[PDB]
Design a protein around this ligand. Structure first.
Ligand SMILES: [Mg+2]
Ligand SMILES: [Mg+2]
Ligand SMILES: [Mg+2]
Ligand SMILES: [Mg+2]
Ligand SMILES: [Mg+2]
Ligand SMILES: [Mg+2]
Ligand SMILES: [Mg+2]
Ligand SMILES: [Mg+2]
Ligand SMILES: [Mg+2]
Ligand SMILES: [Mg+2]
Ligand SMILES: [Mg+2]
Ligand SMILES: [Mg+2]
Ligand SMILES: [Zn+2]
Ligand SMILES: [Zn+2]
Lengths: 136, 46, 50, 116, 88, 179
RNA sequence: UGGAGGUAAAGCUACUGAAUGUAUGAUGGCGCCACCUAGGCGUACUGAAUACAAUUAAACUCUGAAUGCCAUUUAUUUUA
RNA sequence: CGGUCGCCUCCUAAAAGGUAACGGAGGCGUACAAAGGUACCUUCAGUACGGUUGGAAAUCGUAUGUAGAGUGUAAUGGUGUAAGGGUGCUUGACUGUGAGACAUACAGGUCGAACAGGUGAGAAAUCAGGUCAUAGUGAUCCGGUGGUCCAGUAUGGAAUGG
RNA sequence: UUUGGUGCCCAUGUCGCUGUGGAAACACCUGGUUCCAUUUCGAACCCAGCAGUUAAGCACAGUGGAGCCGAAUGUAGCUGUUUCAGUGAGAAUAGGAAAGCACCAAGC
């Protein structure tokens, strides 16, 4: 569970996922990458599921990079509570994924395993994923 | 600066073996005070 | 509220013409300033008045 | 930490900033600069940024660095200012303490019809 | 069931001071009129412009106000009152 | 000082010839010897500091200015606004007098003056001498502070290279190991 | 046409926090020795600082618009 | 039921100003006879090297470093020759005022050129009507205190008022 | 035109490296007996003189190392109407860059 060690403010305003791609737009560490086609909020739980999936379907020498990180937190008012009396407490951490951000990249294992690995990682995420390669 | 109670007066210093009356300004007795180990009376220097 | 204010009165006509502040805990000695006096129409010593 | 000339420039900048901030009547500004050998003087105008009058030890051809020649320099600059019909001046040093040669120049200028 | 609700702790705000520019560039101005209200000198004073006990810029003579950018990397702002200077 | 004139002639000639210096004042020149006999006992035994100053006075002929710390530390009992330590900076004739008096009277009286050099220059040409005891200095009577301390005599030079500073030291015959 | 501003965007070697990989690596954990105290050789590993490549922010800014706002110039309209 | 009720700072507040919620973070009900005024002088923190006590870190010397230092305080803005530090002399932390503006339903609040009197610093120009700026505050009525060129219920006082 | 002083500017003006220079001036420098000064030091400030001096500073030529500035194209955001026309950033880049504008005194 990726989680920031400390934050200045416990309850920040949510960060919009509508728009194009600011950074993390092109594969620059590996050479195959999982691009998104639909901006959405995905939490550290989905990252861990996807990361564990990649590692289980990886080999003995493959290497992977996780680009996105759940910097922003989100709150949730307790159940059966009427509106008012302040904001709720932080519950889960979410990374902001915009349309066009490369979430996971893989390298150093043949192409078919890498294509399969990115597929299982993207089936764990809500965004509509797509495979991309690194420019020569 | 000046107007001090501790006056720097040129006092002479004698030494054993080699006399070497070195005159140096100091606020001490105005006479030939004898030092027992001077610079010239040291195995390191000579 | 706290009362750190003090009154300054002339020493010729014995009239109080100024209102200032003073810390009795820090400053133990009575003020002996010199200020303008409306009555005497000149500068004169003003001292602390109870 | 520095050399004498740099500290004098820094102090001169302080004086110039103050004068340009407070000189409301647009008086002529008499900056005198003293060196180890000689001392010169020039009357600038911060509104036009030009020099109206000038005087120097080089101009007067004297073995200067003495309090004696400062009086001669002050008399010459005050005469030139009077000819220029300007008498309301502000006097600032080049960044040196007002004393000795600087004080003599100012007093000679003041005693020759200047208003400062 | 209401289940009860917690309590909020920060609901305090101060009155908004109506700061900012008062006289725009090119506007004619008489002496003693405010040109810029600020907390700390955001706009430096120039010629014919004074300062107050609240860092408030006010005019010192008749004329047209004028802003000029100066300072390192042109990051400092300066205001002035260019006198009428009609001069026939 | 006669040795000051001797310094002038001798330092000029040897140094000028030793490095083919194109000007006589290219040779290094010594500027100021700071003495810093500082003690933190003024936090508790303020009296001690006073005596300290007088001994420092009695050694140089300049009254010592007491220095103040620029911070505050609880573990050291330090607090801002207090005077802990005196510093004296000798120049002109008095500095050369003190230098000669140190090297000729005070230093060879040191219990074991084996010396330390080469490993003392700060890389900019300075030099610090850490004295261990004050009593060894001739300008001090036996009656003194209940605690005894040392000194931090330091040196300065016109040059910025430590090697040329060492060259000046050798020309002055400052008696250290191989230097 | 002139001016005030610090938002959208973008950027984090331009700061404050958060933060990914590679390389050199303080540091500790971990050992194995000697030494009872000064330490030393490798560290399944932790990770200061630096370099390279890449990130995040209503209460981050080395930057940075458009619109809008103020004033003025010209043309037209209304006695508000 | 719990929480809050006045004032100040930032964000939400959408680059003029203004803009709400039991929205998100904090403070105030002061302090300083110097931390005010003036004249003069002066400029970081940290780090590197070198040095008795003395130690990771007290002080000293040199260099580097462009603010991470200081500016009494909660934040914001400002300010590195400044508004920060030191010294000398002082009390303008004045009297009577006040053209013109900001912001405002009102009541109140904020800035202020300039004039007269008498001062402080300074050679002079100039500056000083409290502090780097924004919180540090409560109407009216009632009664008390000091001064006073006003009244004093027939007149002179007094009482009682102004 | 060159040197020296100064104002305006506030890095395309800096930091640094390599060389050259002084006629006059600028500077270090020579001393503290005078006016003046050190929270202690004629270091600094202030005096009165130019013996020595081109290390410095200062002034010139080279140096694209650090720092700074930065075109055109394209793109993100905006305004309208479109689902296309203007407006046009930030970042990155070719590259520029060893300041510039005036006044005064001297030999020119
Ligand atoms: Mg507000
Ligand atoms: Mg944004
Ligand atoms: Mg960052
Ligand atoms: Mg209740
Ligand atoms: Mg606004
Ligand atoms: Mg708006
Ligand atoms: Mg603060
Ligand atoms: Mg003072
Ligand atoms: Mg102050
Ligand atoms: Mg009642
Ligand atoms: Mg009656
Ligand atoms: Mg040279
Ligand atoms: Zn002997
Ligand atoms: Zn009176």
């Amino acid at each position: 569970m990726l989680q920031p060690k400390r934050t200045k403010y416990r309850k920040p305003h949510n960060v919009s996922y509508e728009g194009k791609a600011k950074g993390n737009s092109y594969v620059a560490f590996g050479e195959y990458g999982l691009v998104a086609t639909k901006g959405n909020w995905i939490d550290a739980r989905a990252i861990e599921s996807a990361r564990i999936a990649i590692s289980k379907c990886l080999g003995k020498t493959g290497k992977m990079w996780i680009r996105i990180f759940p910097h922003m937190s989100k709150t949730k008012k307790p159940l059966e509570v009427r509106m008012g009396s302040g904001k709720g407490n932080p519950e889960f951490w979410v990374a902001v994924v915009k349309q066009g951000t490369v979430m996971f990249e893989v390298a150093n294992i043949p192409e078919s395993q890498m294509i399969k690995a990115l597929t299982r990682a993207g089936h764990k995420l809500p965004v509509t994923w797509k495979i991309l390669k690194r420019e020569e | 600066k000046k107007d001090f109670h501790f006056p720097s007066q040129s006092v002479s210093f004698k030494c054993a073996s080699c006399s070497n009356s070195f005159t140096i300004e100091s606020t001490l007795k105005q006479k030939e005070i004898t030092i027992d180990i001077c610079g010239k009376c040291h195995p390191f220097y000579i | 509220a706290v009362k750190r204010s003090t009154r300054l009165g002339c020493n010729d006509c014995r009239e109080i013409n100024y209102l200032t502040f003073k810390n009795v805990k820090k400053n133990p000695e009575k003020l002996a300033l010199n200020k303008f006096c409306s009555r005497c129409r000149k500068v004169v010593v003003h001292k602390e008045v109870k | 930490m520095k050399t004498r000339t740099e500290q004098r420039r820094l102090r001169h900048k302080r004086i110039v900033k103050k004068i340009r901030a407070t000189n409301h009547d647009n008086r002529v500004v008499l900056m005198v600069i003293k060196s180890l050998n000689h001392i010169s003087v020039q009357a600038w105008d911060f509104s036009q940024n030009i020099v109206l009058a000038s005087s120097s030890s080089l101009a007067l051809k004297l073995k200067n660095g003495n309090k004696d020649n400062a009086k001669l320099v002050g008399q010459d600059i005050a005469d030139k200012l009077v000819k220029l019909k300007l008498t309301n001046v502000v006097f600032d040093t080049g960044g040196s303490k007002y004393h000795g040669r600087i004080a003599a120049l100012a007093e000679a200028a003041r005693e020759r019809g200047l208003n400062f | 069931s209401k289940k009860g609700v917690g309590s909020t702790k920060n609901g305090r705000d101060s009155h908004a001071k109506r700061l900012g520019a008062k006289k725009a560039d090119g506007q004619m101005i008489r002496t003693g009129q405010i040109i810029y209200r600020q907390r700390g000198t955001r706009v430096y004073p120039g010629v014919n412009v004074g300062l107050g006990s609240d860092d408030t810029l006010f005019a010192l003579s008749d004329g047209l106000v004028k802003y000029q950018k100066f300072g390192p990397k042109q990051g400092k702002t300066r205001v002035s009152v260019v006198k009428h200077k009609l001069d026939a | 000082n006669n040795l000051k004139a001797h310094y002038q002639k001798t330092i000029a000639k040897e140094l000028q010839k030793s490095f083919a210096f194109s000007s006589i004042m290219q040779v290094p020149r010594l500027e100021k010897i700071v003495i810093n006999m500082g003690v933190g006992d003024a936090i508790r035994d303020s009296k001690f500091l006073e005596s300290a100053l007088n001994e420092l006075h009695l050694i140089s002929g300049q009254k010592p200015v007491a220095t103040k710390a620029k911070n505050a530390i609880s573990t050291y009992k330090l607090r801002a606004g207090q005077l802990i330590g005196c510093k004296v900076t000798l120049r002109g004739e008095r500095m050369w007098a003190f230098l000669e008096k140190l090297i000729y009277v005070a230093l060879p009286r040191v219990r074991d003056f084996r010396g330390l050099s080469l490993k003392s220059f700060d890389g900019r040409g300075n030099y610090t001498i850490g004295i261990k005891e004050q009593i060894i200095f001739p300008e001090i009577v036996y009656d003194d502070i209940k605690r005894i301390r040392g000194f931090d005599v330091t040196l300065v030079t016109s040059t910025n290279k430590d090697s040329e500073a060492l060259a000046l030291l050798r020309a002055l015959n400052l008696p250290l190991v191989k230097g």
